[PDB]
Structure formats: C-alpha cells, structure tokens
C-alpha cells in the first residue's frame, strides 16, 4: 500500500496578461552626453535593493557582482520565454535596463588625448540581488532546470532559489556563526585593529567582515 500524499493547489494563483518578459532596449530612450567615472563600487559588497521576493516564488540569485549588457538580457529573455509555459507561469525583471555608459577609445591610440566615447551601456549588479523573479502554478523543480541553465551563462556566480531555499540558506549561515568553535573571527579582529591588521585591510572590511573580496562573495566565510 504505497502511501499517497495531498498535493498543493494553485487555483488561488493569478496570471498577468503579459506573463513573458518584456523587451529590453540596448540604450535608454534619450542618449546621455555627460561621461561618467568607472565607479567600480556599484558591484562591490552586499546589495541593499531587490533582496526579497515581491510577487513570485522562484528567482535567480546573484552570488557575485558584475555588469549586465544587452547580450545578457536577450539570453535570459529568449531562454526563459521559450522554456516556460505562459499559461501557468509568469516572469518579471528585477533589474533595470542598461543605463551606465561605458566609454572606449579607438583602436591603436596611445594613452592620453582626453576621454573615450560612449560605446555601450550596462546594468551594475551586487551580490545577493534577484535578477529574475518567476511564479505561477508550478513547483520549483519545473523552473529550476532552465533557471540554472540561465544562471550558468551569467558573468557572475548565480543560482536558482525559492522562498524556502533562500530562507534556509540564510538560517544555515546564522547557525554556522553561532556554533563556530573558533574563538577568533574576522569581525572581532578588524574592529579592534588587533595586530595592526587594519594596515592591510580596507575600511569596507569593517562591514563586509571578510565575506567579500572585490566583486566575489564567499558564502563559506563566517
């Protein structure tokens, strides 16, 4: 007598009128003229925006910082719109369209001569941000296939998650910090400037606590 189990019902879920992902334009409506600095600290450190679910239940989590250009948006769009069922699924963008201008000088020129011309636009992304959010009358095992396929093609470390796996990830990291048998931690040492260690550290290391090195995030660090 193989024991059967109840199944969740998604009848209470609603599907929008345009479930598929909208198209993203290469450049914004009005082209920018003022050239901007590199400002690399827009992909450095943890994210303070789009870290929680809004409408859906499954998403792609960013495990590192990077810049997204149009080529990335097309791959995500087509790959998802092709592999998903419009009737029982829907998807939305959790990242704005390319707005940061990237200048570039012409080939063969030497150092100097001013600043280059605007070549393309990107979208900065920090670690811990949701890139795409999905939902509908579907389990996670269904979308997890092509979401991970998408996550692997992104320029940073990404991974598909759900409302449960994301929560579990965060609770397991807190559990590690509490049961850690090591009496020495990066925070305690840095904040107290023990060994004069702040001579080889950064002011950001007071807040990142060793979990970030440039654009890379290290989840195994407590």
């Amino acid at each position: 007598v193989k024991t059967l189990l109840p199944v969740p019902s998604f009848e209470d879920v609603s599907i929008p009128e345009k479930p598929k992902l909208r198209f993203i334009e290469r450049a914004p409506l009005v082209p920018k003229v003022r050239r901007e600095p590199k400002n690399l600290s827009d992909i450095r450190g943890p994210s303070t925006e789009a870290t929680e679910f809004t409408e859906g239940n499954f998403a792609i989590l960013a495990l590192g910082g990077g810049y997204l250009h149009w080529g990335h948006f097309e791959m995500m769009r087509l790959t998802i719109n092709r592999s998903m069922d419009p009737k029982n699924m829907f998807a939305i963008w959790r990242v704005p369209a390319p707005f940061k201008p990237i200048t570039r000088k012409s080939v063969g020129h030497r150092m100097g001569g001013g600043k280059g011309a605007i070549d393309h636009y990107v979208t900065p992304v920090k670690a811990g941000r949701l890139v795409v959010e999905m939902g509908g009358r579907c389990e996670f095992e269904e979308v997890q296939g092509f979401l991970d396929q998408v996550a692997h093609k992104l320029p940073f470390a990404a991974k598909a998650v759900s409302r449960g796996t994301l929560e579990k990830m965060r609770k397991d990291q807190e559990e590690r910090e509490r049961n850690n048998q090591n009496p020495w931690t990066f925070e305690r040492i840095a904040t107290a400037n023990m060994l004069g260690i702040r001579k080889v550290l950064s002011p950001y290391d007071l807040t990142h606590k060793g979990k970030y090195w440039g654009k890379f995030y290290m989840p195994k660090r407590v």
Binding site: K105, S106, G108, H109, R110, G112, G113, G114, K115
Partner: peptide, 18 residues
Amino acid sequence: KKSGGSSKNLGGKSSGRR
C-alpha cells in the same frame, strides 16, 4: 602613428581659497 583627439574641456585650474 595613429593620431588622437584632444580634450574639449578647458579651465578648472582654480586654486583653493583657504
């Protein structure tokens, strides 16, 4: 070899007023 353009921004050489 290949010559390059110049900067179009002038000025901005004022010193601090203390």
